[PDB]
Ligand binder design. Structure first.
Ligand code: CTP
Ligand code: MN
Ligand code: MN
Ligand code: MN
Length: 321
């Protein structure tokens, strides 16, 4: 019910204050605090993002919510507690992790992502699916980014919410990320209401390239104008910012912004040039990809950019489309 949803949100927003105190003030939170500061998190940024620490006692969140008169079973359904099968008892889901509040589109905290700081697995532990937290709908930083997304008429999608935080601080405001999932149809519906321009800047590795192709193709099929920023090998935005600085980052992100079709064929370049079977199939694919582009201006430019990869003229490629 809406009433239960509100209770669950309250739990999240109240425990946030305690997590923040635990991180910034308490003895147990000192190592986690140092880890964050070594990653460039200022005291102001930590406060701004509401970042906290979950102690390792396994009943920190439990005792707090109990004291505040919240229904324990509801706290479990809210994804803040876990439950033992045998003893039927409840305990903290998040233990010895740095706590990143996850806000919904309306700016309310509806979940957490807990990162290890001691090399534990899993690296990130998120809230489970709950009535208020749904990964297929939530986009990290959306409530904060919405204003700049509309004004710049563009959204930039990153892989990690950590990259989003750093990019935001660096000056790139129109950035969001999924919570470790593939962009969903619901996400695209939400995004379409804000802008028709979407830029993908995933990690500069093989997995990142693959995710870019899959996500880009989906977006293109749904009628969005898709662009790609290719990061240097082995780097994500956070690592780029840390190595080159904020000014270098904001310059980089507005430099080589390529239409999806152009990025795609550049990836397939060698296979096309060596494998004749792949040559034919990818010529048909890219023809189809270009035909999907709503922007006639960018469609024409894509034809000019893609054609040389197949050793054909722009006119020959245009005919195939
Ligand atoms: N055990 C994990 C690790 C990763 N992810 C998700 O996958 C995204 C991208 O993966 P990764 O590249 O590892 O994120 P980073 O920002 O690089 O994490 P970090 O800088 O803290 O190492 C993360 O934002 C996280 O939400 C996850 O759901 N569960
Ligand atoms: Mn990766
Ligand atoms: Mn990364
Ligand atoms: Mn990273």
């Amino acid at each position: 019910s809406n009433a239960d949803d509100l209770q669950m949100i309250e739990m999240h927003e109240l425990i946030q204050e305690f997590y923040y105190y635990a991180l910034t003030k308490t003895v147990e939170g000192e190592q986690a605090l140092t880890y964050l500061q070594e990653r460039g998190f200022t005291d102001a940024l930590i406060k701004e993002r509401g970042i906290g620490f979950a102690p390792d006692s396994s009943h920190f969140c439990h005792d707090f919510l109990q004291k505040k008169g919240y229904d324990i079973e509801l706290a479990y359904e809210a994804g803040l507690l876990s439950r033992n099968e045998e003893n039927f008892s409840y305990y903290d889901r998040f233990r010895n992790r740095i706590m990143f509040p996850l806000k919904n589109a309306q700016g309310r905290i509806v979940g957490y992502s807990g990162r290890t700081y001691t090399g534990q697995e899993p690296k990130y532990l998120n809230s489970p699916e709950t009535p208020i937290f749904q990964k297929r709908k939530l986009l990290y930083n959306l409530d904060k980014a919405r204003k700049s997304i509309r004004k710049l008429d563009e959204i930039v999608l990153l892989e990690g919410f950590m990259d989003v935080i750093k990019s935001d601080t660096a000056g790139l405001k129109n950035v969001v990320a999924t919570m470790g999932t593939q962009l969903s149809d619901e996400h695209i519906t939400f995004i379409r209401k804000l802008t028709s321009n979407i830029t993908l800047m995933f990690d500069g590795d093989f997995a990142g390239s693959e995710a870019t192709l899959k996500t880009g193709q989906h977006l293109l099929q749904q009628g969005l104008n898709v662009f790609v920023i290719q990061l240097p090998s082995g780097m994500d935005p956070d690592e780029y910012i840390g190595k080159y600085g904020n000014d270098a980052f904001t310059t980089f992100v507005k430099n080589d912004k390529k239409s999806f079709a152009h990025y795609k064929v550049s990836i397939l370049k060698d296979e096309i040039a060596h494998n004749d079977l792949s040559y034919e199939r990818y010529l048909k694919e890219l023809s189809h990809d270009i035909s999907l582009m709503k922007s006639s201006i960018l469609q024409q430019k894509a034809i000019n950019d893609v054609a040389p990869f197949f050793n054909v003229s722009p006119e020959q490629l245009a005919n195939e489309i």
